[PDB]
Symmetry: D2
Amino acid sequence: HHMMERLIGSTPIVRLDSIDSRIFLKLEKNNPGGSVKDRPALFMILDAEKRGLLKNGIVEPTSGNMGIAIAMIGAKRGHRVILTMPETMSVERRKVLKMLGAELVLTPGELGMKGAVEKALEISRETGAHMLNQFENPYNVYSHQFTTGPEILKQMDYQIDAFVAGVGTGGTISGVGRVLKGFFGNGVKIVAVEPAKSPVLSGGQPGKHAIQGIGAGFVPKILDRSVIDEVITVEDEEAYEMARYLAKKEGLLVGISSGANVAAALKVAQKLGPDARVVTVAPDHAERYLSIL
Amino acid sequence: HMMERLIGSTPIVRLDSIDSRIFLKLEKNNPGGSVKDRPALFMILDAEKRGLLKNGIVEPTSGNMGIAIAMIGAKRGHRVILTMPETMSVERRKVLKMLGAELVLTGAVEKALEISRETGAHMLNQFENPYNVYSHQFTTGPEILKQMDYQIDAFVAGVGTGGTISGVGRVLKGFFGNGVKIVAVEPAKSPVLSGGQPGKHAIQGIGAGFVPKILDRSVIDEVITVEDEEAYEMARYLAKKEGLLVGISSGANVAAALKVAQKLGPDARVVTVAPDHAERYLSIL
Amino acid sequence: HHMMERLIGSTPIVRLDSIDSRIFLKLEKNNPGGSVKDRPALFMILDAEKRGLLKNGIVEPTSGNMGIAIAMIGAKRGHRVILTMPETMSVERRKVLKMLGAELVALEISRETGAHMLNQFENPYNVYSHQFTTGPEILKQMDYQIDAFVAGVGTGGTISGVGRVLKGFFGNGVKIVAVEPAKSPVLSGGQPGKHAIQGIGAGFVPKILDRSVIDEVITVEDEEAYEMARYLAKKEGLLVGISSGANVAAALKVAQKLGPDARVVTVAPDHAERYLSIL
Amino acid sequence: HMMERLIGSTPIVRLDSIDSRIFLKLEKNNPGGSVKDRPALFMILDAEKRGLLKNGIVEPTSGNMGIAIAMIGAKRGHRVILTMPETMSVERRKVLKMLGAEAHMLNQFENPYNVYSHQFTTGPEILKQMDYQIDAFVAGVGTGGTISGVGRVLKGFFGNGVKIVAVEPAKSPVLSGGQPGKHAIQGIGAGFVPKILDRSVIDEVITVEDEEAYEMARYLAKKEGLLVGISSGANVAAALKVAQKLGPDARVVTVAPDHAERYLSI
């Protein structure tokens, strides 16, 4: 009965009237897996199913959310799921993966996502499991081009001055950016967000940072830079502070990357008009981070 | 109108990997992560209208009602004090602090009543307040009726406050009359509605150990009990078989719904509620 | 696949900020039969099915939109539909009914054929349709903030079902205002009369009208209803029928007595293209 | 933002009383009573952002695009001037005057914002509403906006896994490489190939006869209770032929561009 198909997406947008009424926040925690990544996960799996690539299941590297989404969709749809994830990601992710019956292989913190990718490739070779490859798979961008972006455009009454989003895989900003630039052209500003400690998109060196779910340490092959107008950095403590602030002031239980996005969106909105409309995303929820937030 | 717009309009999913006769309404989609967002909103909106909240809100709670109240209070500018038994999952305590509620851990009603006298803070009283029932009469029930294409054989729900079963039950009985079976669920270890004595149990969210004043028995046909272990087991099963990250009371409701479905035809349609999400119970599930 | 169940209801509300921003209008033409009547028709038919009343089909006497709704649902669900109708109602109605396969010609028919009369003025399921769909929709769509709900009475199902819900939530903090034609002011204590406000003003007090939830009755002239229907199309781009003009005209009178920030909700029962010959 | 919020997000119904392989998107639910509210909105919003509407709008009409533009112009405060063949239903004529229609041309056959409306609204809707499972999408071509925008999205998602089928009148089979001619399927068959038609996303063209379209529109009303117009009959007639070639379990989506009460005179 198409459970996951029907549940994933169509998430709400709220105006942050207690913080800055120019900021509009899309609440991706409403997805059944608790994050925005249910969308690319579903698209990638559906493509892989159609092409007959999953006889031996799935193995995928993850910072947590894409893995949770894959694990959930695999549990329902009948695919074995193996994930690799750095040991530095919140322990809540590990427990959720176990609950969903996925197999989790932790990789060295110091090797970051690169380490997770390498271990996934090794497991793929040993087991025959299929890597969807969230950093290279066009269906990641398509999920946002065909669901998230269309949603945003209409939910915002076709009036948007800026769209702001952290880059993990770059799927969100690429797919949404394509739609919004398609509609508005240079009437809309698309702003990528990354950690001050790992400013690779800005042309800097990778580094250790605490904003889980962004700042992969390299430039994803799927990132569509043609739709991005600029890159803004956010400090670890600014992201944490804003996530705490969202819960306290708006009653919105969002994760650390949501904090980062809203902190960035505030900087973007302050640089322009009092009637500016700046949209961003809250990728997931606060209870996936109680261990650290 | 942030909380007004966010709360309710939750999806229903058919549990095809467990039993395709069971349909589960996913109340974790609510902004506070549970079903209690609905009564918390209605009760607050009524208390605001009536000018009762100038000293804030104090409520004794199991957890979800407190989270809902704390969230709405955070956004709408009400001081929220909660008294909560220490036995409830610690996730609740961290969540309540993040939402800026003042918590006093502890039945615990004595402390809440004490606090009300000392501060003037207003007790919404989730067990007595008719707006708990109205929230389900005017949101949840109408949603379920339409979402199920006006075809329901049974509605099964755990009773905490009784709001959900009473408000949904009124709508369903109004439309179906005797053609729908309304089943209340309670813990085997505290089978008060069945006529037994109150007891300690682990099905968080249900089984208050008394009959709530708001419970509308006129809409309820039968009472079914569930064991603590059945509830936990079915909660884990929902995550592993359906990919559904639901809490303990969701396991209890679906365990009961299966029992109900098993007594009915092949094509019976049995609806129940998943009150909250699995990540609220990582410490125990 | 429950076609009619899924299509009926969940209609939008729009704020009339080119006419008066205090008025909020629920667009019932979005229903598959083009009117509010799809809701009571659905509820009454589902009840009758449950109770095994439809072996010989349906016969119902109507002004028009209820006939269209019943014809449509009968067509989809496989019930014979016989209708009886006054000639003074838009001809566009006769063509639509035949398109939907209704047999046009009630008590005698029902007696002779065994066809079942739904009895739109007496059937509690008319009210329930609004108590369980329309009312709940309005309450949430309006963010739980309503000063008044204004609606013309045909069968009285809309105002009764919505008013039950809004009174439940708001108590005396909401005003429920019935609208009727000045020319047939029966709810106001006057004598029935011929009038042009198609869809309201049946000339008697319907049995299902729940007068317990109604605070006041307002009248509208035939010319006011027509002028406002034309105004809605020209100023708002809203292609609504005559009873919609009546409802908005009344709602404006209600709003004008309230503050600048009042929120007054009303309904647009059907669409303008059902009245080309007369509007 | 009245028109922004009302336009789009229309339902799909499965035609179980005709053929349960056919899924119909009901565009009469739009406030102007047709699919053309979508391109009219997008083209008008683009023209406003570009400052092109100081002197209002003037445009060519088969019918529905005129109604949509007149409606949106009425609400948003733009003067609207239109032109139409007398062969189209007189219902349209009364509606336009109701909306106050009597300057910038939008150019419905050449304006990319027509295609964008379907690329960003209709296509995404269809993809989700069909649970990402579609074997064919079948649509008549008037401007070609619908098939081009929906086609782009569905080809992106399914590639050669989805068949995109254009529909035109047997009496004017121009997309098939034949000659134009007069026909009665209002809303399609313009008699030339629109500039915006994306031929890179279309797999085939199927023709429908005038009587086929009419019979099927009457069939939809009598069997499904769906009060749809002539071009909706054409679309479903075509989808039926497509589904019949595909077998038991095929999922074939099409569109019902407008409503039956716009054609009572025919």
